[PDB]
Amino acid sequence: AKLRASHTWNPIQQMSINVDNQFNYVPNNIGAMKIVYEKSQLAPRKLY
Amino acid sequence: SLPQSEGATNFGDIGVQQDKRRGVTQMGNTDYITEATIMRPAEVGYSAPYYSFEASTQGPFKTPIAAGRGGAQTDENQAADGDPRYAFGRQHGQKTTTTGETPERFTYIAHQDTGRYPEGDWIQNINFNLPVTNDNVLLPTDPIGGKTGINYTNIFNTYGPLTALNNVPPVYPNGQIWDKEFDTDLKPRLHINAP
Amino acid sequence: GVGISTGTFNNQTEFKFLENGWVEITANSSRLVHLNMPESENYKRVVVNNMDKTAVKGNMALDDIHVEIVTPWSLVDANAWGVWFNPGDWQLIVNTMSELHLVSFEQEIFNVVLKTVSESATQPPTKVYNNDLTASLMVALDSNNTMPFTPAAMRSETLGFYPWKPTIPTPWRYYFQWDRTLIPSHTGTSGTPTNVYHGTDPDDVQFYTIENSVPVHLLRTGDEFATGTFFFDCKPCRLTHTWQTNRALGLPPFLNSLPQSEGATNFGDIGVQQDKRRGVTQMGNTDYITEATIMRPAEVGYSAPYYSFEASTQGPFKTPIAAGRGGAQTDENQAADGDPRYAFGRQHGQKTTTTGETPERFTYIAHQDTGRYPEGDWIQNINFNLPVTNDNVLLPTDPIGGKTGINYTNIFNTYGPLTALNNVPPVYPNGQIWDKEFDTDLKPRLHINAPFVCQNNCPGQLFVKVAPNLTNQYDPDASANMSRIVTYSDFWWKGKLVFKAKLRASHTWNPIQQMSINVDNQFNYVPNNIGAMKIVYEKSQLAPRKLY
Amino acid sequence: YYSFEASTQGPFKTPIAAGRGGAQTDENQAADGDPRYAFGRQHGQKTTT
Amino acid sequence: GVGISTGTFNNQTEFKFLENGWVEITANSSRLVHLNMPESENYKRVVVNNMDKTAVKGNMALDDIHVEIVTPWSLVDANAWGVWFNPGDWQLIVNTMSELHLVSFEQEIFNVVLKTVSESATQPPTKVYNNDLTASLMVALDSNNTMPFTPAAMRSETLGFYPWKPTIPTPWRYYFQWDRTLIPSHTGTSGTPTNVYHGTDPDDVQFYTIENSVPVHLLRTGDEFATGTFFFDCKPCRLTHTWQTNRALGLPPFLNSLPQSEGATNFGDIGVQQDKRRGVTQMGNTDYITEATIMRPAEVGYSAPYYSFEASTQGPFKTPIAAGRGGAQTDENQAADGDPRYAFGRQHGQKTTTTGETPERFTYIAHQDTGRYPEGDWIQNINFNLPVTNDNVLLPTDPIGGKTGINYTNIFNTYGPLTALNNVPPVYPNGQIWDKEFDTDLKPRLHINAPFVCQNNCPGQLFVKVAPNLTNQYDPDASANMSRIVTYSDFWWKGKLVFKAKLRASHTWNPIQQMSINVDNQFNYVPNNIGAMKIVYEKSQLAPRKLY
Amino acid sequence: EFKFLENGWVEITANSSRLVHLNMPESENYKRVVVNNMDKTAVKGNMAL
């Protein structure tokens, strides 16, 4: 793949860890694991 | 004309009439140039039947759709622009330390906007002569075939040689990667299960 | 610097014949552009509501709500035909060439002049114009096509079509993601339907800035600027029209009987029965072989919904159509096969010496015949069993959905992998030339606004602005508005557009339809006693071409 | 099916690129467009007809 | 000379990926600067007394008495982040790079314009602006860093953060040795305490002059000036934060017992006694091995006095602190670990379309965790013998010196040869970039105002002034004041700042904290209907990094 | 593994070494099974089932 350059002024929508996410990405006291679904295409692109 | 101060209610007005505006339209009747009227180079995405459960020699089967979004947030047609649905368990998502045998899923909703709100369309007369009159416009609310629940939206297929499209994004994890291709002389432009 | 000239003027149309009937046309349009000082030196973000036309519960195609961001930058568009050729050149192309290949394009700006206005409040008062020889012009080029694409032909915000007439660039502006909902509603639909502008999806927020994203050139009088040569990538444009339907394809029947004398009423009869005729049909029921029944290799053009006003996340919008004709003369469906409509004024057609502010237009009606008369179709039973019975045939007249005005024609989409098609011919002057292409994995087969779409590469947008001229007082720590010296600048623009085409040979016996000067045309192509000029629209593709 | 369209030359049926689509002798002869062929003496058919 | 242009405009951010994950960033900021005529063409020496706030016997941190010498010379500072990057570029750096290396810096000035103002006292009266094409600008460069160093970021006297917005240099000024005495005093301290300004120590008298100590360039319209390329010498800047204290270091205990089901209340218990646990401690008294007791390799950050307002020969001044965080969210000591405070206005953040004259600010709170909660410490006996008894433990609550408000925390300094530390992250925009270094044999480990300190060599200060334009009357044998022609000049400034960084790879499983656009952010990064712009502050180091 | 090349091109290589378990097939013979659920497709409402 290729890398993204910025062309706008306004930041682009990125992926992060909220106070709501945290424990969706870590085992637990017993070892309860799981993988959530997450949007792929999250970055503007001018069509025309 | 532009606002001279702040407020989410200070709109900049063009300052000209709809039937005296310069530009191009794809109509030979009117003189009304609107954001809905004006001629655009083409059409983004298409509009196809929903829940067009076809059938052949093997039995009935739903009609696929290559859609994005098409409405205000949590304001979508989950089936109009075809939003995938994924059911896995224990070994492909889902809380490892679960109980019983019931899959978990999510209705992946992309970010692209090619989808549609089939609840804000209409088919009216070549006469235009608006404000359009009942007998002169077929709306979403108006039944087709005499039955209620049905529409023309439900039976509608606007796919022209002018339809612009974007392929189905990756749906991770779950989602598929690569998928063989049909051995038919003519082949699908894009697959719905894999990028 | 300031004495001396920087360029030359050339608005000449050169035709250079090569070998094997190929000509190399090079149109030059050197127009003198004028430009004023941008009111705001700040970028804006304006929302347009016209929620007082979209309430009348009848008005839904009149939705003028969008979101634009204004740029102090003034653009310059020359993507038009009228700006290149004149009614006398077009005749040459159109009557004698058979195909056109768009080639090169290069812009050049010279003899920059910047003058300041001194308002001598004395009696009248009076105005004193001077030259700020140290002033500047801010020229910029989006050579890496980074910004949106705003073809200023759409809204006749092009450049003057009369060279000896000074013109004006268009204030730049582009779209900003605006989210809306609006449900239809006739004059009767009870209650208040639904229509609102939530705002903007934080995902689709692209805020462009020319200062940030492109190299800016300051030119003073002594300076000059030149784009270099850009080569386009585009399939050729045909200067021919197809007049063949589905009834004018293949081996016609053999007429066992022919007239034995003259009269427009002496028809040659085949001499055989419909249910005993040899040949091929795409039916397994009948034995009737008709000109309507017989199997043709494919289908010319398609049949789509009319006035299929769709809608998405931005709001309702009409469904485009790639149509030709499809009926007897002055016997057409102006909207069924999609006939363009053009509104310009004073500077792009229209009688120069006009009054008031009302655009003039024309509904360009091609010569190709791929269009349709949706008023002569029908959907009947698989049983056929004609003469077809009511309950066994859905006609145009027969309503659908219970409402009158509606049809199945209105809701109909016959577009099969068998649909044959011809692109949208040039609409001169007015009409557009070339148009960028959608960045969608899947792309439209053809565009409705322009014959040439450049795929991999297009020439970039030329944004022309005036540099802020400041006074002795300026506090960047003051909102006010950088009260500046009332400055404007006049500069000469030149253009070289290159086209390469082929010549038409005769193959028929009957002359072909050419362009001429009637006793009705004459004064449509000449100034008048006062100097009233104007450019009429004229059909491009007027020459037969056999489809099959 | 039986989308008999029309243009400037007159009405004409809408072609279809179909295969089968049903149990044997259980088809829509016109839905998936099944060709029909009429010849005589010199391109099939019993010579001594 | 005067026709022709001297430079070009470029405010572009270029990223060029090299090999092995190294990028070479080059930020260009070409701003158009305006500058007025210095009121005095003479150097001044002004003393500032505010001995009316320092008398209230409560007010001691409000001592605004210093000594400065004013220079007719107007400076130009670009030592800021906001002046280089935009909120959209910063995202790229910060979300995807792991370290930053400041490289090159070169300034360029072009398209010099000098205009005279003619005040035509007639009715209004009216103002007539003209061009004195023979006028001059006095550009100077302290390439041999000979003069003091006045980073104009400290007091938001930088350059505009919006390129399409014309800015203004800062009138130059520097310190002159001022001698003072001032003794503290609460609201009660009886009598008149002590506070005076003796003057100046004849030893420490440095009277600089730009005319005397640096080569001056006169540029006319036709001229141009360019600094060449200066290379900096600086350790790299990390774009990561440490979240490890002293309790998150090493091999945790072994849990002999683990929960057998879910619940945020099912804790895994070790299963052994505190006075029978194996391991190492830094105590020879106890047998208690705890997470607080156990011997750690060293100590992260330090603990110093808060609000340790010291003082010397120039007057009292607060004690700096190199801190991170040190508490639950919105559970911090804003002053204990030293959290910066930034006040700007209109031209360096803040809503462009504001009113009145009141700065806006933010208290930048990093992500690193080296800071402290001085509200959870204690000093107890060598006897230990807990549960500790009052007379055997000095806590935060327990006053020191008999006064309430005071602590031992307030007077405490735990900085040992075992103190681990992380430098002050970038604070964008506002924040400073690079800062000279003290000329003291012994030097500070790190600066509190800037991530990059250039040791051996820094780029020199650019001092920009207007040349005296004289009238027909001038007697150098007259004090008056060389009544001169009201002249000002507008010139374009360009900048090329070079940064070289590396890219971040993932090593965890859990996503890392990135920068994004919420439904709450959106309109913080876009102009508005009127063109109200503004730049918000945003955390730099937001990505874990293992300390040990 | 992510390996940055020239001109902003990366070459990603994902490796997934999983330990698979597998039991003995019940039948060592090939089958041909038909599935009828003609008890959900009778309710005259259920057709997508």
The domain ranges of chain E are 1-548
CA pair distance E270, C199, nearest whole angstrom:
55
Residue E292 touches chain F, beta carbons under 8 Å: no
Which residue does chain B place closest to C356, by CA atoms?
B20
Resolution reached, in Å?
3.3
Residue C440 touches chain A, beta carbons under 8 Å: yes
Beta-bridge mates of residue E137: E219, E466
* Beta strand spans in B8-118 (E): 23-25, 43-44, 54-55, 60-61, 86-88, 104-106
Residue that the structure tokens 């002004």 belong to:
E46
Contacts of D2 in chain C (CB under 8 A): 378-382, 384
CA pair distance D17, D13, nearest whole angstrom:
13
Residue A35 touches chain F, beta carbons under 8 Å: no
**E469 assigned ligand-binding residue:** no
Q: Exposure of B146 by Cβ count < 10 A (0-12 exposed, 13-18 middle, 19+ buried)?
A: exposed
**Listed residue (C48, C150, C25, C32) closest to C94, CA to CA:** C25
The three-state (H, E, C) secondary structure of E211-276, written as one string: HHHCCEEEECCCCCEECCCEECCCCCEECCECCCCCCCCCCCCCCCCCCCCCCCCCCCCCCCCHHH
CA pair distance C55, C195, nearest whole angstrom:
9
CA of residue B110 relative to chain centroid, distance: 13
Contacts of D14 in chain C (CB under 8 A): 299, 414, 416
CA pair distance E524, E537, nearest whole angstrom:
11
Contacts of A5 in chain F (CB under 8 A): 8
Q: CB pairs under 8 A, 24+ apart, for C22-26? A: C22/C500, C22/C501, C22/C502, C22/C503, C23/C97, C23/C500, C23/C501, C23/C502, C23/C503, C24/C103, C24/C498, C24/C499, C24/C500, C25/C93, C25/C498, C25/C499, C25/C500, C25/C501, C26/C104, C26/C496, C26/C497, C26/C498, C26/C499
**Listed residue (E12, A8, E106) closest to C211, CA to CA:** E12
CA pair distance C118, E72, nearest whole angstrom:
32
Contacts of B86 in chain A (CB under 8 A): 37
φ, ψ dihedrals at E211, nearest 5°:
-55, -40
Beta-bridge mates of residue B23: C343
Do the chains C and A touch each other, judged by at least 3 C-beta pairs below 8 angstroms? yes
Size of interface B-C (CB pairs under 8 A): 321
Q: How far is CA E399 from CA E379, E392, E403, E405, E517, in A?
A: 13, 15, 6, 7, 47
Residue E11 touches chain A, beta carbons under 8 Å: no
The alpha-carbon radius of gyration of chain E (Å, integer) is 29
Q: Taking a C-beta distance cutoff of 8 angstroms, is the pair E464, E139 a contact?
A: yes
CA pair distance C186, E71, nearest whole angstrom:
75
**Listed residue (B99, B86, B84, B50) closest to B173, CA to CA:** B86
Contacts of A15 in chain B (CB under 8 A): none
Kindly determine whether residue C377 and residue D13, on different chains, have CB atoms separated by under 8 Å.
no
- Closest partner residue to C477 (CB to CB) among E113, E131, E347 is E347
Kindly determine whether residue B137 and residue C342, on different chains, have CB atoms separated by under 8 Å.
no
CA of residue C439 relative to chain centroid, distance: 20
Amino acid at E341: R
Contacts of residue C103, defined as CB under 8 A and 6 or more positions apart, other chains included, come to C24, C231, C232, C498, C499, C500
Beta-bridge mates of residue E159: none
- List, as one string, the DSSP characters of C84-104: T--HHHHHHHHHHEEEEEEEE
Kindly determine whether residue B160 and residue C70, on different chains, have CB atoms separated by under 8 Å.
no
**Residue E315 neighbours by CB distance under 10 Å:** 19
**Residue E229 neighbours by CB distance under 10 Å:** 12
Contacts of C345 in chain B (CB under 8 A): 22
CA pair distance E15, E501, nearest whole angstrom:
10
**Listed residue (B162, B186, B167, B164) closest to B178, CA to CA:** B167
Binding region of C for Mg(2+): 144
CA pair distance C209, C69, nearest whole angstrom:
10
Which residue does chain F place closest to A2, by CA atoms?
F9
Kindly determine whether residue A17 and residue E510, on different chains, have CB atoms separated by under 8 Å.
yes
CA pair distance E515, E536, nearest whole angstrom:
13
Size of interface B-E (CB pairs under 8 A): 14
Exposure of C483 in the CB half-sphere (CA atoms within 13 A): 8
Q: Taking a C-beta distance cutoff of 8 angstroms, is the pair E246, E548 a contact?
A: no
The one-character DSSP state at C471 is -
Residue numbers followed by a gap, chain A, C–N over 2.5 Å: none
CA pair distance C433, C427, nearest whole angstrom:
9
Token pair recorded at residue E243: 């979240």
Do the chains C and D touch each other, judged by at least 3 C-beta pairs below 8 angstroms? yes
CA of residue B79 relative to chain centroid, distance: 9
Size of interface B-D (CB pairs under 8 A): 6
CATH class assigned to E1-548: mainly beta
Contacts of residue B20, defined as CB under 8 A and 6 or more positions apart, other chains included, come to B31, C357, C358, C359
CA pair distance C455, C506, nearest whole angstrom:
34
Contacts of B97 in chain E (CB under 8 A): 262
**Listed residue (E292, E187, E305, E195) closest to E249, CA to CA:** E292
Residue A4 touches chain C, beta carbons under 8 Å: no
The one-character DSSP state at E90 is H
- Closest partner residue to B41 (CB to CB) among C58, C401, C447 is C447
